[PDB]
Each structure stands twice: as structure tokens, then as C-alpha cells.
Amino acid sequence: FSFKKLLDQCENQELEAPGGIATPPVYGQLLALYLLHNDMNNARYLWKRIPPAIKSANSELGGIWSVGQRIWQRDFPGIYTTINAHQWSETVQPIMEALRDATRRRAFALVSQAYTSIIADDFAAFVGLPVEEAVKGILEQGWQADSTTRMVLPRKPQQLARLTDYVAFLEN
Amino acid sequence: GSVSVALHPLVILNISDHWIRMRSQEGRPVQVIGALIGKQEGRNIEVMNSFELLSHTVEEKIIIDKEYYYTKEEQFKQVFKELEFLGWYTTGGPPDPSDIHVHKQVCEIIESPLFLKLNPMTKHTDLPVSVFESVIDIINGEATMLFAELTYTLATEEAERIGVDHVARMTENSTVAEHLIAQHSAIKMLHSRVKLILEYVKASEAGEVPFNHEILREAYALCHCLPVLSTDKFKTDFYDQCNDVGLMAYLGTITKTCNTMNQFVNKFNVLYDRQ
Amino acid sequence: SIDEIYKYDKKQQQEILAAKPWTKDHHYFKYCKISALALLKMVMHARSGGNLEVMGLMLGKVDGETMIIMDSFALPVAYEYMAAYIENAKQVGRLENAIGWYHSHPGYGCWLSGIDVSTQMLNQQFQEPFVAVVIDPTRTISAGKVNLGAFRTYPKGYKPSEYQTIPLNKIEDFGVHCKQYYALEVSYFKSSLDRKLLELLWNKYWVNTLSSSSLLTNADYTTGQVFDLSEKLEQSEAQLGDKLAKATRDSCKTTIEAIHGLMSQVIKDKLFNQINI
Amino acid sequence: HADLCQLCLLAKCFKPALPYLDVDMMDICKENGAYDAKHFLCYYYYGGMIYTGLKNFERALYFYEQAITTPAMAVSHIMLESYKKYILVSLILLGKVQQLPKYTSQIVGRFIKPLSNAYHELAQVYSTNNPSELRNLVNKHSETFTRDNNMGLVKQCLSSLYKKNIQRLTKTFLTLSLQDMASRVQLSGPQEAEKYVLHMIEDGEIFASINQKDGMVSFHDNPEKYNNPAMLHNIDQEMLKCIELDERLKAMDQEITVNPQFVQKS
Amino acid sequence: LVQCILDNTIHGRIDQVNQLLELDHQKRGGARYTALDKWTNQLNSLNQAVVSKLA
Amino acid sequence: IIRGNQLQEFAAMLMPHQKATTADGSSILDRAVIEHNLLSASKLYNNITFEELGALLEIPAAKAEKIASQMITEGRMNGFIDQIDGIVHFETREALPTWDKQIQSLCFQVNNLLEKISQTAPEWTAQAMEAQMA
Amino acid sequence: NLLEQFILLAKGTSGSALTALISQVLEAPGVYVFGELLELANVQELAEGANAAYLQLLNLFAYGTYPDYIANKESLPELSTAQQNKLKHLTIVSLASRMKCIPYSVLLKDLEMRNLRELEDLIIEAVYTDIIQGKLDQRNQLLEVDFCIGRDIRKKDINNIVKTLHEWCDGCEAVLLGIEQQVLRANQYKENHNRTQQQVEAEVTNIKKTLKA
Amino acid sequence: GLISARVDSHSKILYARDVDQRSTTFEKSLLMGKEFQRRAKAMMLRAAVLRNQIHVK
Ligand SMILES: [Zn+2]
């Protein structure tokens, strides 16, 4: 629930500024929050909104955009690869951990809905877990796995007041 | 049934219309006399459509003008093959000696006459109780027969039910209110019945009334039957019906909006662009 | 106290009959006020013949543009029996005279047949105030609502849709004899006072109301209403490029009936299903 | 409103302008006669481009249509560019260029349309459902599209043609091999077809599943049974919109009836 | 069976892969939706006429 | 449903020509009683399989289906047969119409229980409802 | 009810003579509610002595079901074939009160039946006795119960009768209160709309008065 | 539209397609309502530009 206010407070801080340019630390917070909610349209325009002087001075903004670039092309293995490739500051560390976990639920829902049978090697890349781990995870959720083929088979497991409003409108 | 008397709602409306017509014609309310017919099956009454039988009401005495009824007999026999004379009706309160005299006159025609006394001036909730008919009490000397009231039933056919429903409040006061008042009355009487049953159960629990082992068993069965159709198919059908009615409302809110928009553009074309 | 429908005023009736205001304009009569007793007896006689056909006379008076009906008596049937029974109108003590005839169509809609319109033409020609009632027993029994058939016809040699449910057979008779009569708006009047007090016997039922089974009882009626509304709206569109107001009114009434049925169902569900969960 | 949209456009901050673009405008402030058609055209052109950057092509197409339908007798650059972007957006959201309303000024179809010829032939090639021809026209008219600054909208038309072709497969097939599908939509590879189909399922554009055991894609054309209570909620949301629309329509004609200028001429 | 079906004397269809003949004891009174279709089609043309009355 | 334990006596008073066989090993007597059992079982069942229909009417599967389809196409019995799953569907309720009749039965139970209360304690019943509404 | 004549013959008998008559009651067809007989002081006197097990049998046939008999089979006396069928019928009534769609698997568990044919035969003969009305469903393995008789009552579930009836009464009152609110709201909507159209008509005519000066 | 069927190109079976009247009616009615609402809100804006006399010289 706390993620609702954090995104709004960073957006407002960018709107009003003492000199029209916001602080470097709040730029990374806004970019990370956009990626957490899968709002890639505003994140992409935020990258162009960052002045080149700020982007060149702070290398953190370049790194956070690398993670977003993977999400933009829907490169699931690259989302986990770039998240752990670099070390982030403490003010955006907890939300970026939530971004990595949020990507994990996105992969789980995508496989459960868009796949009737997915090979284990590709399925492990989607979730971001090692191949052996992904084998043990599915049975805990009831998903069937078959040996000698290494293939996973996922499957998805005031009316009265309103009505009198309709009549009153029609009868005037 | 214990006395097997079954009145039809058409008779009550007939008597009411007769009384109202005579009251309007003569200015003041006036006593009326009628003739109830019906089907007799040994121990069954089954009153049906009644006719006028004006007769006479002269001064304080009722004269025997039953020759007019005799002429009306063959007339009503042409349209009612299986219907026969059963009794007569009146408008007033408690029975009177004049009613006794008219009943004595009527017993000349038929052996088992009834006596309906529909009261129009009543101001109390339950309906005036139809007929006070008697088996005629005989004592040594003068007969001095009285009337021994026995219960009545309001058995009605489907056509009568539909007609009565149409005359009753059904579809300034809006149609929503008229439709909802009928439901309010039905739910109110159901609630009164259930509340009185609950009061009897509480009285039996406390000890005011003797413990009847069968009434509480029936009450337990009634309580167990209370969740009517709670199936998943019933819910699916109910939601399908609700969605269908919602679509039928959308198609028609759209029509009303189109009509109002047409009126708006008609008024707009004669205000700005004068062509 | 309202009322005032009763108390037959002889002088006014003779004056309006001698004036003959409907001779000048053909569309004089537009409203038909049937009584409670009239409807009760008419529907009872209509259903007391089953699929067979019944017919009788209906008594009433005329006031301005409205025709009020106070009573109705059946007939034995074409032979001498009907003519002998006709004398009932002047034999009893009643000041209402006779205003028209009613006859049932058991399963053939509510329209007027060719022989029916010819008899109505003759009756209007030699008995100036006359109306024809064409109620349907089967439809009111099946759908639970009474359909009215006040269908006064036009004069001979003069030139100037609702219950279109006849599937195949008699629809041909409907088409040819369609412009020869015009419907009358039926507006029921209750005398109030005694009858309004005595209408509590309807409340005695309380079970057919609580379990009405609407929206399926008259599903065919609503489908027919929508089918009529479709070309009513098409005619409104063709004229536009006020029939649109009439189409909107019909849509409003049909939608109101549907929502009333849904409200009854919701009330029943709240009363019975949502208890002891 | 035009200035706010322009500021939100040059700074690429499209979210602050959203509350001022989600409301349908009713009556226009005359500002003592200082309001002209330029302010009307700019609001519905910049606002349409704001929605385009947010991938909201349903309302972006609506905004462009309003600018085109503005009455005019002289050629306007804003109306010209809005016509160019109207074709591209209608080619992305829909499979064809939506027909303009009848009350469009005759100048649009006689001057603006001839000046927009590269976009009209692009629509014609789009109607042939052949991506290779579409890419040839994009390269041929690359200078025209980049000069008009709408580079990327045309590239989105190329990608949307593949989605349109895949959606047509659902109208004919229950199960199609990935290789066979890639040969009909010219994706050149079963791996490419698998990625294209998976993205469509994620976005909800298609109802399908991927079976890697047999290398087949099965189309499950079962959107909704219109039975759940959520459908009832959707119905009353649309019903409330119509009721509010009717209330405004009835109120504004009641202003006409009480107008002293009115009923004098009636 | 094919000749009878083509002659409309047998109301059903043949499932060839299962060697079946499934009859047509279905298609109840769904004419309400057909009536709603005509209502929707008439309304679709009605909006255009009102908006585009004269200009 | 008439079983074989109450039909041996009836065969005693049958006339000799009425005991003739119908070229199937079944006498005339136990041919109209399996048709009667089938029609009567249509009221106690919404759907029955072929195997269980023959486990109740004897004649397990060869002629249990044949008799079921023979009663239909003649108007004697209402239902349809799905031969793939071997189920005879007799008659089903459409949920909503069943809801109305179940409500009516519930209301009838209230009325019947109301009469019982008044019969047992007429004095207690009378004073009850008058003050209840007020 | 057949139990009335049985009560008269047991008004004075006690001990072994009463016990023999009790067995007749439990076997007599058409008797399914042994409540009035149980309240007799002669029957309750059997609690003390060697007939305490026989009293528990009558309590089992009044309030208990077949699974209760299985658990306490050793203590209770032997039951005849007719008595066991009656207990099975009463078990179906108890299940019918809880739910109106009894699964076949549930019924097979309590009634102790090995095959589906025996269970359906028992249900069919239970419908014949008119204690339960319903239809069998082989495809869904359900017993749709439309009506079941009320079993025996005790002085512990009378409060449950009050609680259920009070809930029904409160639900009826809530519906009535809601209907009254909708009636007045609809009336207010109609009168507010009627006032608006009267104001417009008055304004139009007032303008016409000024113009025609 | 001459054949109402779908091709299953795995077992090579042509399956006849049975459309659902209820689902089809609901989706086309909601589509008509959405189009009508868009058209009405567009013309009610046009009434503003016509009343205010907005045009390009
Ligand atoms: Zn006729």
C-alpha cells in the first residue's frame, strides 16, 4: 500500500523545482518506480527528460535505464541479469528488489496463461531461477512435470437502488 | 373444509357495483337484494356470478316480486347451463327481522338458501364476512329461526385471479412506487405470519402454551427449508437474467438519449443557423 | 370523493346523442374507459369457452371524447336465442343502455377480422355510438396481463402493428383489413370507495405475487414488443431523414416492465435465498 | 489548454496533462473574442500526440478527428499534420483508415489530402496485407516521413501489420504450427512467430496458447460468457455514462427554450 | 445420412473423426437475442441520422 | 415400480393365452411391467445409465436401451438418449421455474402451520396478531 | 397418525411388556416421529434398570442417525431388517435438512452400502413412503431433495428455531425498509422533474407576455 | 464467410464452428453503445464550435 504515495511524491517534486531541474537522487527513484509498475511509456520519456549533464555525471541513472531497456524489449533473462549485474544505492535498493520479485510473478502468470507445455530450460530462464530449482518449484504449485523429456506442463487452476434509478430516468 | 362454502371474488364486485349504482341513482345509500347462484355438489356451495333481483323495498316491508326472478331464471339458464339458485345477498350490518322475513320468502323457492350481508360501511381491516346462512332452528311454538354463521372460503379461478390483479394496483405516483407497494404488502403479510409463528415458538419455549410436539417439528422443517435454491446453477441463471435485463435497459437508455439529442438539435437548428 | 362516473344524467346523454358530434369528425372517439366489473365478466366469459369463441354486449355511456363502459352481459351463442336474450338490456332496471359488443379471439391475437369489421361498420352506420372489444383469453392467461381490443372502425368510402404475434395463418387477414379500423387508448377507471376498499382480496393471495416467475411468463410478449419497436424506430429514422417520441415511449415501457421483473426477482432472492447462509 | 499541452509536449511530461485531456469539452470560453481556431486546433493536435506517446490510440484518433473536422476555408498547418497522423493511428488501432465525418470542410479533401500522398499510398499497401511491400514504401518515402517528424509511428504500422495478419489466422485456424504460421505472416522463423504470439497474449490482443511439445499454437476463441457479475458492473458503468450524457443534452436544450432570442423565431 | 441431411429430412450433423451422428435437439427460443440484434442495428443507424440531420 | 416378488400371484389369474411369449423369452405379463417400470422410473430419475437401468429393470443392456427408445418416438415417454455415454435423460428442471415453486411450497407451509397454531390455541392466537401490527 | 393408537396401549404397561411394544413401534410403517411416546413417564422410567439400552434405542430412532448406531452397535440391542431400513430412511431425512443436494458418496458412507444399486433402491423406496420428495441424478451423483419431513425435536434446538425465524423476520423488515426508501426517492425524482418542466414553461410564457406588449 | 468452420492443422480435421448468439448479441450491443457515446460527445463539442463561431479564415 505504501508504494502508492511514494510514486506521487516523487512526481510532484519534479513538477516544482527551485530552478526547474530536480535533484539527481529523486530522478533514480522516479525511474525505478516507473519500472516497478510496468509503466514503460513514462519511463522512456523520463530518460529523455533527464538533462545530459546530470546523466553523464551520475552513472546510476545509466545503470537503471539498462534494466528498463531489457523490460522494454521483454527480454526476461536480461531483466534478472542486469538487476544483479550492478549495485544500486540504498534509497532505491528496496524498490528494485521489489522490481525483481514483481518480474517473477509476471513470468509465472505469463507461463501459466500463454503456455500449455514449456520446456524446462526456457521456463527456468523466464522465472530467473536455476534449472534444477525450477523443477522443484512447479510440483509445490501442482504443475505437472514429465521425466525423460524435461518438459513442464503448466495449467491454470445496492442493486435495488440502482434498478430504481434506471426506471426513474426512463419514466422521467 | 368444515362447512364447504366457497365464494368467488366476482360476487363481491357485483354487489359493490350494484350498491354504488343504486347509491348514485337515489342519492343516499339504499339496501339492495340479490340472488346468488352456483354449483352444489351435496356438501359444497361455490357461489358464482350474481344477478340483480330488484324485488321491492316498500316502506318497511319487502314484497314478493319473485315473478321477475322467475322470468330471470330461464334467461340466466341460457348462458349458465350448470348453474342454479343458491341464495341471496344484501347490504347492511347485523341481520335484521326484515332479513328474516325475506329469508322466509326465499325458502319458498329453494330448500337451502344462503344469506350474504356484504357490509359497505365497514371501517375495520379484515373483509366483511360474506354469508350468514343457517340450518334454521326449530323450537316448540313459533319457529323463530336465527342465523348461525359458518366460515367461507375465497376459492378463485385463474381468469378471476388475473382480472383481480389487473384491477388491483399494478402496472403521478410513478410506476416504480405502484410496482413496489404490491411487493411491500405481500412481504408485510408474509412477515406478519412468520412473526406470529415465531411468537408461538417463543411462547411454547417459555411455557405460556402447551408443548405440541408436531407444531415445532413443522417449524423446524420450515426453518430447514429456508435457504431456497442455493445452487451454482441457480446463481448462473440469476446472473444471466440480470445481465439480460441490464442489456435491455442499456438498449432504451440509448433510445431515450437519442430522442433527447434529436430534440436538442431540432431546437439548435432554429436558434443559431437560420436557414 | 372523485367518482362522478356513476349517476347517469339522462338529459346530458340525450343532448350529446342529439348533437351527434362524431358525424363531423371521424376521429372523435379516442379513449375507452372499461370498468372493473366489465373486465372481470368479459375475461371470465372469454376463458369460460376455452379455445371456443364467445361474444356478448357491453353497456355504457359517452362523455366528450371518452366512451365509458359500466357493465357487460354475455350471450347464449345467431339463431333466435341471441335476439331473445338481447331484450335483457331494456328488461332490467338500468340506465346505461348499450354501447358496444365484445368478442374473444382465443389465440388469434387481438385484431379485427373482415366479418368483424363489416359488422362494426353496420353497427356504427345505424347505431352511432358503438365500439368493438377484441380481448384474447389465451394471451392473458399465458402472459398474466390483459390485452385490450377497442377497435372502432372507419366509415365506408373514407381513407385517412401492436399485437403482431399471429405466426402464419391469420396474418393474411390482418394485412388486408388493417386500415379499416383504428385502436382506442384503453384507460381503466376504478370507482374507488367501495371497490377500492374491497380490493383487499387481492392482498389475500400474497403467494402468486411472492412467486410470480416473471420475465419468462411473458418472454414472447417482450420479444414481440422489441420486434415491433425495431421497425417503429426504422420508420422514425426514415421520417427524420413525431414517430420518434412514440418509439421512445414504447421502449421506455418495455424496459420498465423488464426492470420491474428484475426488481421482483432481486427482492425474492434477498427474501429467501439470502437467509440461513 | 493548448499551452498546457504544448508545455507537457516539449518537456515530455505527459501525465500532468492527462486530467485536462480525459474530460470531454463542453462549450468554449470566448475570452472576450480572443479565442480563435488556432487555439482549438492546437489543443486537439498536441493532445492527440500526447495520447500517441502513451500508446492510447483510441483517444488519440478521436483528438485528431476533431482538428480535421474544424470548419475552415484556408489551409492550416496544424490541420495538415493532424490529417497525416490520423492515417497512421487509424492504421495501428484499426486495420484501415477510418472514414471522416460528413461535416468535414471541403478544403480538407481538396487541398490537405493532395499534400498527404505518401500516407495515402501507405494505407493502400497496408490493405494488401503484405509486409515486404510496406517496408519498400517506407524506405522509398523515408525522407517524407522523417521531415514530418513522425518517424516511429510509421514503424509501428509495420509491426501492427504482423499482428493484424496473426489475428486473421484466428478467424480460420484452431491449431497452427509455428513454422506454418511464420510462412503465412512472413516472420521468417518459428522462433520469431513464438515471440510474436507470446507478446500478443501478454497484451491481451489475442486469445491463444503455445505448445512447445508439438510446436503448435492453439487459438482459444472464448473471450467471455457474459454471465459473471463483473459483466453487470460493466453494463451499469456504460449505462451511467449514457444517463449523464442524456442529462447534459436535456439541460442544454432547456437553456435554448428560456433563451429570449428563441421562441421569438418559433 | 449425407443425402438425408442435404435434403433437410434429418436434422443433424456427422462427426466423421468419431463416426457419430449428433442430432439437433437444441436451439430453444433464443429469438430474444435476434430481436435485440434488430434493436441494436436500428439504433446504430438512428444515431448517425440524428447527428447528421442537415449538417 | 413393480418387482417380481408381487407378480407371481397375478400370473395365476391370467388367462392362458395371455402368458404367450413374444419371441424374446419374455411373457406378455413381464413386458408391460418393464415398460411400466421404465415410465415410473422416469419420475424418480433425472438421468440413468444403461447399466443401472438394467440393474433395476433386469434385462441389462441389450433391450433396456431398445425399450427406452421404443417408448419415445411414440409419445409414451419423454426424454432423449445419448448413446455415446450411455445415459437416458428423462426430464430436467430449469432452476428458475423450480425456484418459484419451491417458494410457493415454503409459503404454503407457513399457511398450514398458521392453521395448526389457531386450532390448538384459539384464545392465544386471536389476541396475537392484533397487537403485533400495532 | 399411527402413533396415536400405540400411545394408548402403552399408557400403563411398564418393564418387559413396554419393551415389546416399543419394538412394534419401531417396525410399524408410516411412523417416523416418536416424540409423544418418548415423553411418557412409562418410557422414561426405563432409564433405571436393565432397559436403559432399550431407551437409548428409542432416542436413537428419534434424534440419532445410522452412524450413531454403528458407533454404539455393541450397547444397543439387535435390530430387525425393517428397523434398519427405517433408520436408513431417517438418516436420509437428516442429510436432506442440512443440504438439498446430497452427493452419492456422502450417502454411501453413512448408510453402509457397498454398491450404487442398493443405495438408489433405498432412496426410491424412501420416496414411496412420502417422507422425502426428490429426484435422483446419476450423471452428477446427486440426490436433489425438494421436501423432507421434520424429524423429532428436543429441548435444545428450539433456540435454533427462534434464531432462524428471527433472522427471517429481520430480513423481511430490511426488505420492507429498503422498499419504502425507494418509493420516496422515486416520488421525489418525479416531483423534482415535474417542477423543472413547470419552471421552464412558466419562463417561456412569461417571456411571451413581455414580447406581446 | 461461405464456410463457417475452422481448420485444425495438427490432426488435419475441419471443425464446424457454432457461434453463440447470446455472446454475439452482447458484444455488438456494447460496441454500438461505445460508438454512439463517442459520436454524441463529439457532436456536442461541435455544437460548441458552431455556437461560438470558430473557423479558420
Ligand atoms: Zn373476431
From Swiss-Prot, chain A:
GO biological process, one term: COP9 signalosome assembly
Pfam family, one: CSN8_PSD8_EIF3K
Domain PCI: 1-157
Keywords: Cytoplasm, Nucleus, Phosphoprotein, Signalosome
Entry superkingdom: Eukaryota
Subcellular location: Cytoplasm; Nucleus
The UniProt record lists the keyword Signal: no
InterPro entries linked: COP9_CSN8, CSN8_PSD8_EIF3K, PCI_dom
GO cellular component: COP9 signalosome; cytoplasm; cytosol; extracellular exosome; nucleoplasm; nucleus; perinuclear region of cytoplasm
Role, per record: Component of the COP9 signalosome complex (CSN), a complex involved in various cellular and developmental processes. The CSN complex is an essential regulator of the ubiquitin (Ubl) conjugation pathway by mediating the deneddylation of the cullin subunits of SCF-type E3 ligase complexes, leading to decrease the Ubl ligase activity of SCF-type complexes such as SCF, CSA or DDB2. The complex is also involved in phosphorylation of p53/TP53, c-jun/JUN, IkappaBalpha/NFKBIA, ITPK1 and IRF8/ICSBP, possibly via its association with CK2 and PKD kinases.
Family: Belongs to the CSN8 family.
Subunit (UniProt): Component of the CSN complex, composed of COPS1/GPS1, COPS2, COPS3, COPS4, COPS5, COPS6, COPS7 (COPS7A or COPS7B), COPS8 and COPS9 isoform 1. In the complex, it probably interacts directly with COPS3, COPS4 and COPS7 (COPS7A or COPS7B).
Protein's UniProt name: COP9 signalosome complex subunit 8
Curated annotation (Swiss-Prot), chain E:
Compartment list: Cytoplasm; Nucleus
Record PTM text: Phosphorylated by CK2 and PKD kinases.
Quaternary structure (record): Component of the CSN complex, composed of COPS1/GPS1, COPS2, COPS3, COPS4, COPS5, COPS6, COPS7 (COPS7A or COPS7B), COPS8 and COPS9 isoform 1. In the complex, it probably interacts directly with COPS1, COPS4, COPS5, COPS6 and COPS7 (COPS7A or COPS7B). Specifically interacts with the ligand binding domain of the thyroid receptor (TR). Does not require the presence of thyroid hormone for its interaction. Interacts with CUL1 and CUL2. Interacts with IRF8/ICSBP1 and with nuclear receptors NR2F1 and NR0B1. Interacts with NIF3L1.
Family per similarity comment: Belongs to the CSN2 family.
Function text: Essential component of the COP9 signalosome complex (CSN), a complex involved in various cellular and developmental processes. The CSN complex is an essential regulator of the ubiquitin (Ubl) conjugation pathway by mediating the deneddylation of the cullin subunits of SCF-type E3 ligase complexes, leading to decrease the Ubl ligase activity of SCF-type complexes such as SCF, CSA or DDB2. The complex is also involved in phosphorylation of p53/TP53, c-jun/JUN, IkappaBalpha/NFKBIA, ITPK1 and IRF8/ICSBP, possibly via its association with CK2 and PKD kinases.
Name of protein: COP9 signalosome complex subunit 2
Covered range of the whole protein: 389 to 443 of 443
From Swiss-Prot, chain F:
Compartment(s) of residence: Cytoplasm; Nucleus; Cytoplasmic vesicle, Secretory vesicle, Synaptic vesicle
Its biological purpose: Component of the COP9 signalosome complex (CSN), a complex involved in various cellular and developmental processes. The CSN complex is an essential regulator of the ubiquitin (Ubl) conjugation pathway by mediating the deneddylation of the cullin subunits of SCF-type E3 ligase complexes, leading to decrease the Ubl ligase activity of SCF-type complexes such as SCF, CSA or DDB2. Also involved in the deneddylation of non-cullin subunits such as STON2.
Subunit text: Component of the CSN complex, composed of COPS1/GPS1, COPS2, COPS3, COPS4, COPS5, COPS6, COPS7 (COPS7A or COPS7B), COPS8 and COPS9 isoform 1. In the complex, it probably interacts directly with COPS1, COPS2, COPS3, COPS5, COPS6, COPS7 (COPS7A or COPS7B) and COPS8. Interacts with TOR1A; the interaction is direct and associates TOR1A and SNAPIN with the CSN complex. Interacts with STON2; controls STON2 neddylation levels. Interacts with ERCC6.
Similarity-based family: Belongs to the CSN4 family.
Name by which UniProt lists this protein: COP9 signalosome complex subunit 4
Swiss-Prot record, chain G:
Gene Ontology cellular component list: COP9 signalosome; cytoplasm; cytosol; nucleoplasm; nucleus
Localization, UniProt: Cytoplasm; Nucleus
Record flagged with keyword Cytoplasm: yes
Keyword Phosphoprotein carried by entry: yes
Coiled-coil residues: 179-213
PCI domain mapped to chain residues: 1-150
Keywords annotated in UniProt: Acetylation, Coiled coil, Cytoplasm, Host-virus interaction, Nucleus, Phosphoprotein, Signalosome
GO biological process, one term: protein deneddylation
Primary role: Component of the COP9 signalosome complex (CSN), a complex involved in various cellular and developmental processes. The CSN complex is an essential regulator of the ubiquitin (Ubl) conjugation pathway by mediating the deneddylation of the cullin subunits of SCF-type E3 ligase complexes, leading to decrease the Ubl ligase activity of SCF-type complexes such as SCF, CSA or DDB2. The complex is also involved in phosphorylation of p53/TP53, JUN, I-kappa-B-alpha/NFKBIA, ITPK1 and IRF8/ICSBP, possibly via its association with CK2 and PKD kinases.
Family: Belongs to the CSN7/EIF3M family. CSN7 subfamily.
Subunit structure as annotated in this protein's UniProt entry: Component of the CSN complex, composed of COPS1/GPS1, COPS2, COPS3, COPS4, COPS5, COPS6, COPS7 (COPS7A or COPS7B), COPS8 and COPS9 isoform 1. In the complex, it probably interacts directly with COPS1, COPS2, COPS4, COPS5, COPS6 and COPS8. Interacts with EIF3S6. (Microbial infection) Interacts with vaccinia virus protein C9L.
Protein name: COP9 signalosome complex subunit 7b
Annotated organism of origin: Homo sapiens
Residues of the full protein shown: 10 to 222 of 264
